[PDB]
From a paper:
FtsEX is a transmembrane signaling complex that coordinates periplasmic peptidoglycan remodelling with cytoplasmic cell division events. pneumoniae, FtsEX interacts directly with peptidoglycan hydrolases such as PcsB, but in Escherichia coli, and other gram-negative bacteria, FtsEX interacts with a periplasmic intermediary, EnvC, that activates downstream amidases. EnvC is termed a “murein hydrolase activator” and has been shown to stimulate peptidoglycan hydrolysis by both AmiA and AmiB in vitro. FtsEX functions in bacterial cell division and regulates periplasmic amidases such as AmiA and AmiB via its interaction with the murein hydrolase activator, EnvC.
Occupation of the amidase-binding site by the restraining arm strongly suggests that EnvC has been captured in an autoinhibited state that would necessitate a conformational change in order to bind and activate its cognate amidases. The two interfaces are mostly hydrophobic and dominated by interactions arising from the X-lobe (residues 145 to 171) which partially wraps around each of the two long helices that make up the EnvC coiled coil. Phe158 is notable for its position at the tip of the X-lobe where it slots between the two antiparallel helices of EnvC, locking each FtsX domain in place.
Author numbering:
A (entry chain C): 110 to 206
B (entry chain A): 40 to 419
C (entry chain B): 109 to 209
Write the structure that this text describes.
C-alpha cells in the first residue's frame, strides 16, 4: 500500500472530485478516504499527544487517500509505476511507501 | 539780539533732532517688518511640512497599535500551545509516540506528526515576523518624531522672532504717530518715496536684464521654429516648458480682464484719484484681511522683494516686454527674487507694512517704466 | 495511578505550598512531588520542542504541577475517583489528570 496526502486547500466538492478521479487509476483496487476532521480525531485518539493539533488556530491536517494496489500490481516495479501515475493528477501533495 | 540768536539755533537744532529721530524710527520699522515678513514665511512653510509629518506619525501609531494587538494575540496563543505541550509531558514523556503505533495507522500517525511540527514552526515564524515589523515600524516612528521635534523647535524660534518684531513694531509706530507730519513735508515724503521706489525697480530690472534678454531670445526662437512649421506645412508642438517660457516673457498683453485678481476686496483707491494735494494714485488699493494670500496676476519671475518707505514690503513680478506687476503693503513676501511664479500662485500675504492705517494690497501694473491703470487687466 | 494536578498560575509560593500541604494531608496519599512555575519552566526549557518559542515570550507560560502518588491500597478505580473528587475541591487547583494507562 502507498499512502497519498491531498493539498489542504481542497473544499468538499474538489475532494469528492479527487475521490471519484482515483476510483480506477491503473493498478489500484480501492482507495480509503479520511476527512480532515476524521484525520484530526485519529491523531487525538491514538498518537498519545492528545489535543496538540487542536491547540493550533487552523487544522494542520489534509484529507487523505490510502491506495490499495491490485494483487497483480504489488511487485517493486509495479508499485513504482502506479506511484508515478498519482504524480500526473495535480492536487495531491505527498506520496509515501 | 542775544536770546533771538539762542532760539534760532535751538529751532534748527530742534528740526535736525526731529528729522533724525523720525529717520531712526523708520529704519526700525523697516527692520521689524523685514523680520515679520521672513518669520511669517518660515512659520507658513514649517506649518505645512508639520501637517504632512503629523499625518504620517498618526498613520504610523495606528499601524503599530494594530501589530501590537496582533503580537499580544500571537504570544498568548503560542504560550497556550507551550502550556498544553507541557501538560502533555511532550518534553520528557515523548514515550507515547513509540508504544502507540500500528502497521498503517502508525504510517499516517507519523505523517500527522510532520504536519504538526510544520504548523508549530510556522506559528513561531509568524510571531518572529510580527516582532520584526513592530520593531522596524517603531524605529521608523522614532525617526519621524525626532524630525517633528526639530521642526517644532524651528517653529518656536521663528514664532519668538515674529512675537518680538510685532511687540517692537507697536512701539515704533506709536513713536511715529507722535511726530505730527505737516502737509508740505508729507507731500515731500510721498514724492521722494515714489522716486526711491522707481530707483529700486530700475536696479532690479538692470540685474534681471541678462536673464530677461536670453529668455526673450529663446522664447522668440520657439515662435520662429513654429513659422518653419506653419510656412512649411506642419505644426511644431512646443514643450510644456517652452509654453511656460513664452508665457513668462510675452508680457501682460492687451488689457482684456484676462489676469487673476491679486486679491478680492473693496477697491479703496483707484489709479488717477487724488493721493494728496496734486499727487495721484499710480496704482489701486484693494482692502482685505491681514494674512489674505496675494496671487501673481500672471506667469512671470520675481525681480524685487524689498521694504520701501511709504510702500512697505513690495514684490515686483517681471512678465516680459518691460511689463511688471507690483504688490505692496505686504505682511510677508512668500517668494524670493529669481523665483518663477504662476498665474494665481500666492506670492505674499496682505498687510499694512510701511505704516498703513488698515490691511490692504497696493497693486500696480507698469509698462515702459510707467505705472498705468491696472484695472482693465482684472477679470478672473 | 498517580494523579497530576496543575495549579492556578496566580498562586504565589506560599499559596502553592498550602495546596501541596492539603494534597499531602489527603486520605490515601503516600507523597506529593511539586514543581514550581519557575522549576517547571527550567525543565521545559531543556526541550528542543518549539525552537525559539520561549525567547519571544516575556511571561512564564507554564503552571506549577503536583504529582499526587496514592498509597498501594488506594490505587483501585473507586479509591482514585474519591481522591480525585477531594483534590478537585482544593482551591488553587486548575486541572486534574488521572494516569494514562
Amino acid at each position: 500500500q502507498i499512502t497519498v496526502y491531498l493539498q489542504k486547500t481542497l473544499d468538499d466538492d474538489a475532494a469528492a472530485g479527487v475521490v471519484a478521479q482515483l476510483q480506477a487509476e491503473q493498478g489500484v483496487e480501492k482507495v480509503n478516504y479520511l476527512s480532515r476532521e476524521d484525520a484530526l480525531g485519529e491523531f487525538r485518539n491514538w498518537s498519545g499527544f492528545g489535543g496538540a493539533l487542536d491547540m493550533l488556530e487552523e487544522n494542520p491536517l489534509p484529507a487523505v487517500a490510502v491506495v490499495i494496489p491490485k494483487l497483480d500490481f504489488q511487485g517493486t516495479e509495479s508499485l513504482n509505476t502506479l506511484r508515478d501515475r498519482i504524480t500526473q493528477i495535480n492536487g495531491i501533495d505527498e506520496v509515501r511507501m | 539780539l542775544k536770546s533771538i540768536q539762542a532760539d534760532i539755533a535751538a529751532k534748527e537744532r530742534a528740526v535736525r533732532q526731529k528729522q533724525q529721530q523720525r529717520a531712526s524710527l523708520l529704519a526700525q520699522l523697516k527692520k521689524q517688518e523685514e523680520a515679520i515678513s521672513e518669520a511669517t514665511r518660515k512659520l507658513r512653510e514649517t506649518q505645512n511640512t508639520l501637517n504632512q509629518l503629523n499625518k504620517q506619525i498618526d498613520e504610523m501609531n495606528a499601524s503599530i497599535a494594530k501589530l501590537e494587538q496582533q503580537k499580544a494575540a500571537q504570544e498568548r496563543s503560542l504560550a497556550a500551545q507551550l502550556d498544553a505541550a507541557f501538560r502533555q509531558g511532550e518534553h520528557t514523556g515523548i514515550q507515547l509516540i513509540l508504544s502507540g503505533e500500528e502497521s498503517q495507522r502508525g504510517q499516517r500517525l507519523q505523517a500527522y506528526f510532520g504536519y504538526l511540527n510544520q504548523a508549530r514552526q510556522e506559528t513561531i515564524a509568524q510571531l518572529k515576523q510580527t516582532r520584526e515589523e513592530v520593531a522596524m515600524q517603531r524605529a521608523e516612528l522614532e525617526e519621524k518624531q525626532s524630525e517633528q521635534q526639530t521642526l517644532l523647535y524651528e517653529q518656536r524660534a521663528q514664532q519668538a522672532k515674529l512675537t518680538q518684531a510685532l511687540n517692537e513694531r507697536k512701539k515704533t509706530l506709536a513713536g511715529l504717530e507722535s511726530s505730527i507730519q505737516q502737509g508740505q513735508q508729507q507731500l515731500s515724503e510721498l514724492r521722494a518715496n515714489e522716486s526711491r521706489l522707481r530707483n529700486s525697480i530700475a536696479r532690479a530690472e538692470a540685474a534681471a536684464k541678462a536673464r530677461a534678454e536670453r529668455e526673450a531670445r529663446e522664447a522668440q526662437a520657439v515662435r520662429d521654429r513654429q513659422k518653419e512649421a506653419t510656412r512649411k506645412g506642419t505644426t511644431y508642438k512646443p514643450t510644456e516648458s517652452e509654453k511656460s517660457l513664452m508665457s513668462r516673457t510675452g508680457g501682460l498683453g492687451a488689457p482684456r480682464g484676462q489676469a487673476f485678481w491679486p486679491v478680492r476686496g473693496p477697491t479703496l483707491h483707484r489709479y488717477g484719484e487724488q493721493l494728496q494735494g496734486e499727487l495721484r494714485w499710480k496704482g489701486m488699493v484693494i482692502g482685505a484681511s491681514e494674512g489674505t494670500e496675494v496671487k501673481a496676476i500672471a506667469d512671470g519671475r520675481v525681480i524685487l522683494a524689498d521694504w520701501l518707505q511709504g510702500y512697505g514690503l513690495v514684490v515686483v513680478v517681471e512678465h516680459g516686454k518691460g511689463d511688471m506687476s507690483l504688490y505692496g503693503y505686504n505682511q510677508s513676501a512668500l517668494v524670493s527674487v529669481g523665483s518663477q511664479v504662476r498665474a494665481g500662485q500666492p506670492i505674499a500675504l496682505v498687510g499694512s507694512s510701511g505704516g498703513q492705517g488698515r490691511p490692504s494690497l497696493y497693486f500696480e501694473i507698469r509698462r515702459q517704466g510707467q505705472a498705468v491703470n491696472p484695472q482693465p487687466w482684472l477679470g478672473r
